């Protein structure tokens, strides 16, 4: 009937679950000491006034005043953060051949850093790896604006002088094409795992319903808010509270804490 965290772990142990799909959000980022915008952080952000938060990811605002966005980019630009244990756990899932797909709401790029190959990833809100001139459309490796950003200078096209914008997806914009994998990944999965997000926001929320009835949906996260609440299913399992704790429990139940430990150790030194 109602399943437990341990059941789930045992189903994974017992490779009854071999094709896990994972969706993550900001709850797995805050432990790497990435800020949460949803304070204190805005120390970086509030100053030039955002008239309201979402402006950070509105184009018209950005055109009128890009400074706040680039403060944020400077914070998250790769180098300046490291994968925490929850990434490394998803890395272990991959390395054991168990991971069909990881969908991430985070723009920190910590999943690739952690070691998960690009083919396993969907970066549904984009990436700082790359950029794109807001006017002329010419695209750029991410490093060719590193220093401007690192100096708090607003980068500018050589071609046309417009503002050059990292390929983070703004409000209003099409998500990546790679998002469209969901149609085949979700019905192929035999476990859905949701970490550090409740998925209140479409079109993530609607994604949750695309797995078959038989397939356990495990959330580890402080709350439930989204469609696990609106439309619960019998094989659902909620492990509410602190993300890291939740995941520590699950690794103990898998029997993987020592192997995790080994992996963390090797990558820290790499």
């Amino acid at each position: 009937g109602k399943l437990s965290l341990q059941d789930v772990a045992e189903l994974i142990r017992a490779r009854a679950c071999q094709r896990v799909v994972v969706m993550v959000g900001a709850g797995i980022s805050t432990p790497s000491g990435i800020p949460d915008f949803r304070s204190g952080l805005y120390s970086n952000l509030q100053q030039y006034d955002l008239p309201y938060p979402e402006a950070i990811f509105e184009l018209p605002f950005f055109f009128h005043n890009p400074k706040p966005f680039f403060t944020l980019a400077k914070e998250l630009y790769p180098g300046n953060y490291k994968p925490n244990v929850t990434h490394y756990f998803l890395r272990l899932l991959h390395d054991k051949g168990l991971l069909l797909r990881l969908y991430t709401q985070n723009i920190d790029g910590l999943e690739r850093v952690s070691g998960i190959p690009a083919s396993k990833l969907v970066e549904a809100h984009g990436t700082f790896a790359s950029a794109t001139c807001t006017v002329c459309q010419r695209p750029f490796p991410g490093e060719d604006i590193r220093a401007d950003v690192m100096a708090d200078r607003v980068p500018r096209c050589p071609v046309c002088t417009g503002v050059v914008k990292p390929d983070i997806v703004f409000f209003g914009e099409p998500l990546p094409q790679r998002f469209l994998l969901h149609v085949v990944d979700f019905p192929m999965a035999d476990l859905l795992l949701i970490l550090g997000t409740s998925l209140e926001v479409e079109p993530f929320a609607s994604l949750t319903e695309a797995v078959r009835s038989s397939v356990p949906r495990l959330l580890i996260n402080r709350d439930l808010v989204g469609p696990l609440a609106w439309h619960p299913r019998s094989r659902d399992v909620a492990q509410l509270g602190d993300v890291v704790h939740g995941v520590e429990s699950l690794v103990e139940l898998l029997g993987w804490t020592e192997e995790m430990r080994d992996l963390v150790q090797r990558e820290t030194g790499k």
Binding site: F57, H125, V169, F170, F171, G172, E173, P174, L175, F179, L180, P203
Partner: peptide, 4 residues
């Protein structure tokens, strides 16, 4: 094609 779907929008953020």
């Amino acid at each position: 094609q779907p929008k953020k």
